[PDB]
């Protein structure tokens, strides 16, 4: 324009670049945006009901293949016969089986004691997990109503009760809508109120990583701001270990001896698992916990294999390389791999030869090859989300857990490159300078390989840090049953006798803004954590002393009732303004609205006790010319206090002069108006 | 010289714009690339095959 020969075009270039910088950051936020694992809930066998118990099975190298379930009353009798071709016999004589299958809380989830008998245990556990995964990600499970949030559940349709053409007595129309894989992801979105893509995918034993991949690819784009991605296989009938045994694919002892010379086949188990997932710059902007980031995912069918159940050796290399070129990484960044490790004698040699071809390509540091199934059992459709719970507790515990049955590494694989180090021992895995990434791979019977690359959470240096000790807030307990509320203060009590000195403000933040406002409420404001621990033990027995118990029906709607006269004491709020500036300042606006209409101000009145109010020209109560405005000022400041603490009235009603305060707080009369 | 900054900072603007015209038609193909229906097979109620 004027100076030199550039003052205008160099503004359109600045803009064409900050538009190119902001349009090529939109391409990397739509196909490669990290998807944070906001929380993980899992009902894996071995009594595992939560990942902390799960970090307590992998770390001690405990196998969870105990035996067949007798809690459902199976016909194990016939599941076994010397002749192994009997049409109804099973070869797995063990396996990882949970007792949480024949167990559910119908009343909590709003289903009748007849609609729930029909509820397929796969869905039944998924409903319980959907509530937990939220209750441990912070997000109140009842706060996600009409919120875009996809439920992506992976399920191998399994057969529960009477055939749909042989309807029961109470279970009849609800036998198809409680068992259709359709309504496992759908029951969740209904009970939780979610309005997002509630898709129940089915890709055999990769339906958890496919559901995780289908949720990550539903997030990178944006159709659901949040997403619950996971999968469950709880096997109601012994109909899967009696068919898988008919193709002689099972092991006679139920162990998935991954990458081991004793490999017999799958050690088929049953389990669940759910991940709460959100775009990494949506779980940092909302403060949600970020446990690990799912960098990239890939799904790749085996193609024309040598059998439907037969694995492809060059369709896994193209899925370990699609998830490795969609995450923007390379084969040398992934420290460890949670491989399928089915324990098969022709699927493990093919898996690992696909792992020396996509990862073990001149590896400077050996790949730590490990398998949750070994410690657990082929979790079928829950395997792949039980590998992103294993390799997300491996992120956050600084340790690669064991592969429990692989000391005698199989002789059908070539472990000569020294590029893969099967995890026969707990390998330390601390936070170094290079990000800690892992790979979880689930390949299925249908021939749909899936591979997901996990990375450790971006090191949060400060985040929500410490300020100062001060007034303590109520410990907010609530449950949907009077016997479940005793169990809440029988599990928070333990979560503090196991973890003592836990900041009270932190047990009143993730209990109040971390849980749902369920009917049976027992909040309590505790001076100390032992005062608390005391009330916690009292509520375990139902004895409320120091605890504010109550009952509700999702009630809300408080009413500010305003007494006219007779509620004054000699020291009304003497320290209520000395402890918080939300009452002192609340008094300040009333005072400056009372100064032009009153001489003596309210500030020194409630500041001083009656024993010291006798010398400030303001009697304790008899001065109706002074205490009536004081009453109104105390009243309005207190009402503003409850409003500042989130207590808003559905109605204000005043008695005689509390009418003035009610009008002041209702908005019909200004602060100065009602003050005058 | 190159017509100082008249034929240069305007030569970099036909790249930073022609790259913006190709980094925005990648976003219109990552979100709204219209997919075809190349063929349709149906076995539906009745004689439909």
């Amino acid at each position, epitope marked *: *324009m*004027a*100076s030199t020969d550039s*003052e*205008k*075009v160099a*503004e*359109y270039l*600045r*803009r*064409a670049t*900050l*538009d190119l910088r*902001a*349009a090529r950051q939109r391409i990397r936020e739509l196909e490669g945006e990290p998807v944070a694992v906001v929380a993980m809930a899992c009902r894996l066998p071995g009594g595992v009901s939560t990942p902390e118990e799960f970090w307590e099975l992998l770390s001690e190298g405990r196998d969870a293949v105990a035996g067949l379930p007798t809690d459902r009353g199976w016909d194990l009798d016939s599941l076994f016969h010397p002749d192994p071709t009997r049409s109804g016999t099973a070869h797995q004589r063990g396996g990882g089986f949970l007792t949480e299958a024949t167990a559910f809380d119908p009343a909590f989830f709003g289903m009748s004691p007849r609609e729930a008998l029909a509820v397929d245990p796969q869905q039944r556990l998924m409903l319980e997990l959907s509530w937990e995964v939220l209750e441990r990600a912070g997000i109140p499970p009842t706060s996600l109503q009409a919120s875009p949030t996809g439920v992506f559940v992976g399920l191998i349709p399994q057969e529960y009760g009477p055939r749909l053409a042989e309807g029961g007595e109470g279970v009849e129309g609800y036998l198809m809508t409680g068992t259709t894989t359709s309504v496992a992801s759908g029951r969740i979105a209904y009970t939780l109120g979610l309005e997002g893509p509630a898709i129940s995918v089915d890709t055999a034993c990769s339906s958890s990583l496919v559901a995780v991949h289908l949720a990550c690819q539903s997030l990178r784009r944006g159709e659901s701001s949040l997403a619950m991605a996971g999968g469950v296989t709880v096997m109601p009938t012994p109909g899967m270990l009696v068919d898988f045994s008919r193709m002689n694919s099972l092991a006679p002892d139920g162990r998935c001896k991954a990458f081991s010379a004793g490999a017999n086949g799958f050690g088929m188990a049953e389990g669940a698992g759910m991940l709460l997932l959100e775009r990494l710059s949506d779980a940092r902007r909302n403060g949600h916990p970020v446990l690990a980031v799912l960098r990239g995912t890939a799904v790749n069918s085996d193609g024309a294999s040598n059998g439907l159940s037969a694995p492809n050796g060059r369709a896994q290399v193209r899925v370990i390389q699609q998830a490795l070129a969609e995450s923007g990484l390379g084969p040398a960044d992934i420290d460890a791999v949670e491989a399928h490790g089915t324990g098969t004698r022709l699927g493990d040699p093919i898996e690992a030869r696909a792992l020396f071809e996509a990862y073990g390509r001149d590896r400077e540091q050996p790949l730590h090859l490990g398998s949750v199934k070994s410690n657990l059992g082929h979790t079928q459709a829950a395997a792949g989300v039980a590998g992103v719970i294993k390799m997300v507790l491996a992120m956050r515990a600084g340790t690669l857990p064991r592969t429990l049955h692989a000391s005698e590494r199989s002789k059908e694989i070539d472990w000569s490159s020294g590029a893969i180090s099967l995890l026969d021992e707990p390998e330390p895995w601390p936070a170094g300078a290079r990000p800690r990434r892992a790979g979880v791979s689930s390949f299925g019977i249908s021939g749909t390989n899936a591979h997901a690359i996990i990375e450790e959470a971006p090191q949060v240096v400060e985040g929500e840090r410490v300020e100062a000790g001060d007034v303590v807030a109520p410990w907010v307990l609530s449950a949907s049953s009077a016997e479940g509320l005793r169990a809440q203060a029988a599990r928070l009590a333990a979560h503090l006798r196991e973890h003592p000195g836990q900041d009270p403000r932190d047990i009143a933040y993730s209990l109040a803004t971390g849980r749902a406002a369920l009917p049976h409420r027992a909040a309590f404001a505790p001076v100390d954590e032992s005062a608390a621990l005391r009330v916690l033990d009292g509520l375990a027995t139902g004895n409320a002393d120091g605890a504010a118990v109550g009952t509700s029906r999702a009630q809300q709607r408080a009413v500010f009732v305003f007494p006219g006269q007779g509620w004054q004491w000699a020291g009304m709020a003497v320290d209520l303004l000395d402890t918080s500036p939300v009452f002192a300042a609340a008094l300040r606006e009333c005072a400056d609205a009372l100064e032009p209409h009153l001489d003596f101000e309210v500030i020194p009145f409630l500041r001083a006790e009656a024993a010291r109010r006798e010398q400030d020209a303001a009697l304790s109560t008899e001065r109706v010319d002074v205490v009536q405005p004081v009453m109104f000022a105390v009243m309005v400041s207190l009402a503003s206090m409850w409003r500042a603490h989130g207590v808003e009235p559905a109605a204000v009603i005043g008695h005689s002069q509390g009418e003035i305060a009610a009008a002041c707080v209702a908005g019909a009369l200004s602060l100065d108006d009602a003050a005058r | 010289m190159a017509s100082t900054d*008249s*034929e240069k900072v*305007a030569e970099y*603007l*036909r790249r930073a*714009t022609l790259d*913006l*015209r190709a980094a*925005r038609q990648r976003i*219109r193909e990552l979100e709204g690339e219209p997919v075809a229906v190349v063929a349709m097979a149906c076995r539906l109620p009745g004689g439909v095959s």
Partner: antibody, heavy 118, light 114 residues
Framework: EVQLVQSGGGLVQPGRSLRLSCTAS????????MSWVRQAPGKGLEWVGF??????????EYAASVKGRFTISRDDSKSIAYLQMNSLKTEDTAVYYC?????????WGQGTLVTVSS | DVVMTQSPLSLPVTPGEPASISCRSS???????????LDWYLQKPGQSPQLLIY???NRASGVPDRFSGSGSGTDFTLKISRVEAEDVGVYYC??????????FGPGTKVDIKR
């Protein structure tokens, strides 16, 4: 983000001195050439002036309507643009904006309502 | 001299219907670089003016894809592919060839059409 948040409106009598501050946070303040566009109540935008970048000289170009009256400055270490409005008359009752471009107005800020009434 | 730019000052838009504001310049805004020096600004009613288009056809980031840009050296056009309830206001055709520009133009007074 870039946010050009402004401050400094108010009520004065014709012939006063008023300050208009443009807080720039999100971009390198010294690269752009901030400008101040006036919009009298309910009519079209009129451009008051703009300071060139410190690297472009810092020459300040003003309008014909306000030459010898207004002066515009900028600071990087304190990262603020200034419209120094001296000898105001009745015309300055308006919503003054701060855009981040001499020929390519960008963020525009928010809108500082300045009023010059007697 | 100065570039005099005019437009359909009182253009009505009905929601969901493509609309088209046009600009006509007396002089030629196609500078030698082959880049037009016309910009399209939007002042939404009672808000800070927005930059919709720079260099005639290029759209600023953060601006809805609806606003499309085109034009020769004299006649120009803004093609809103989809007018919604935020697409209403004043559309200023503002040149860049001859800075300084004391005015942003009369601006196209856009209205929801009935």
């Amino acid at each position: 983000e870039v946010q050009l948040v402004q401050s400094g409106g108010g009520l004065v009598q014709p012939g006063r001195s008023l300050r208009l501050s443009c807080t720039a946070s999100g971009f390198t303040f010294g690269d752009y050439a901030m400008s101040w566009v006036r919009q009298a109540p309910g009519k079209g935008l009129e451009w008051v002036g703009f300071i060139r970048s410190k690297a472009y000289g810092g020459t300040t170009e003003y309008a014909a309507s306000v030459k010898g009256r207004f002066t515009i400055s900028r600071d990087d270490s304190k990262s603020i643009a200034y419209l120094q409005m001296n000898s105001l008359k009745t015309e300055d009752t308006a919503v003054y904006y701060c855009t981040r471009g001499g020929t390519l107005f960008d963020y525009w800020g928010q809108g500082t309502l300045v009023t010059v009434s007697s | 001299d100065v570039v005099m730019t005019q437009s359909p000052l009182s253009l009505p838009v009905t929601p969901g219907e493509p609309a088209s504001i046009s600009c006509r310049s007396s002089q030629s805004l196609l500078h030698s670089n082959g880049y037009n020096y016309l910009d399209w600004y939007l002042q939404k009613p009672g808000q800070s003016p927005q930059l919709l288009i720079y260099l005639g056809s290029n759209r600023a980031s953060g601006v809805p894809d609806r606003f499309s840009g085109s034009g020769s050296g004299t006649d120009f056009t803004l093609k809103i592919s989809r007018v919604e309830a935020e697409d209403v206001g004043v559309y200023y055709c503002m040149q860049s060839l001859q800075t300084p520009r004391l005015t942003f133009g009369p601006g196209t007074k856009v209205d929801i059409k009935r």
